[PDB]
Amino acid sequence: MKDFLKYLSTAPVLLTAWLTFTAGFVIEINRFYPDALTFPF
């Protein structure tokens, strides 16, 4: 698991993981607080 972790450190895998996480928290914010046109405050 020394080269597998290095493989997971490559640009495509890291970008895919980061974009999946990013889309995930964006989608979940929009699920829990939907239809947010202005700042909540």
């Binding site: 290095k6 450190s9 890291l14 046109l37 700042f39």
Partner: protein
Amino acid sequence: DIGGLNPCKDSEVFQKRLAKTVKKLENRLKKYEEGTPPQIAIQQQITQTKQRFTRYADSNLLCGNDGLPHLITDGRWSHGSEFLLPSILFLYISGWIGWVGRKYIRTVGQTSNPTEKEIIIDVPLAISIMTSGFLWPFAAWQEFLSGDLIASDETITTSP
């Protein structure tokens, strides 16, 4: 008020839009049976539509002659939650991203194989830099003061 607009809480066309959307959703709801998942989904749609319209009405939002919320982005703090606060939020987040990217580029740029560490990210160092971007406004106005933010004449130029 501003620009001839009126608050959406007193806009008749806004309430007409809400009523028409709710009526369409209820007509769609009529063609399903009992407490079946389709009816539950349509009822959730109706509830969310009503909640969204109510929130937009009670939001200091100005509606035009079409009954749609118009954004007042001239800079006034009265409508500051429409553009100014999201503007500050995005500026913070994007400055964070740019700062951590620049810091990672400059950090692995002083190693033996700078190009290797760009396709194969040093995840420990990347995590170290990324969580340090919360001070990007302060770090930027501490590196610009020291002259470490801008190159001067080592930058390359074309022939003319």
